[PDB]
Amino acid sequence: GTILIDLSPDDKEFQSVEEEMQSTVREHRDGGHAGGIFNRYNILKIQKVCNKKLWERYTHRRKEVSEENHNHANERMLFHGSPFVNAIIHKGFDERHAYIGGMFGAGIYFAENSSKSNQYVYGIGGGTGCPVHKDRSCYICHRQLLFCRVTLGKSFLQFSA
Amino acid sequence: MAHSPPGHHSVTGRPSVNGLALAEYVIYRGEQAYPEYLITYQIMRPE
């Protein structure tokens, strides 16, 4: 059911997604161990993910949350990095995409900082880095992230280091 | 997966040490996210 539509770099939609990707890079406390050493990206492609069944599953849940929270879905656009990006875009997010050992329990994690999600592209802590060179800071290999529409609803605030 | 805290639909991890970090978020139901954009990229070596 999933089709991928390439956005033109001339499209304002490409440009606004690129700007969120680039402008939310930060330095990480691991000195680049997990995700690599970089201040910016070379964006190679941005594709819209179109799947009507997955979209309807999302909007159905969004209305449920919204109705439980004074008609406020508290919807955000957030980054997600994962080795399972190909399964996610075809079958949707589910329990197999959860970070069992995450700081806030076994759930599906998203970040405002694209560079935070970049640390998870090759696995937890960057795993062993890219398949080809085993380099977590590979500058050659193509990486993929998701920029996702996320319903937060009523969110539990955890202050944390 | 775990459940959301009672009466909540997600968790927000607010950074409390690193002043420059943005928030991270957790959902406990896959149906609460849609993967809108697939971005293909490289990280760039600093000059």
Ligand SMILES: Nc1cccc(-c2nc3ccccc3c(=O)[nH]2)c1
């Ligand atoms: N184990 C696992 C599998 C797939 C994705 C991730 C992941 N963890 C994060 C933690 C904090 C902020 C963002 C992410 C993320 O994008 N992916 C973690």
Ligand SMILES: [Zn+2]
């Ligand atoms: Zn590589």
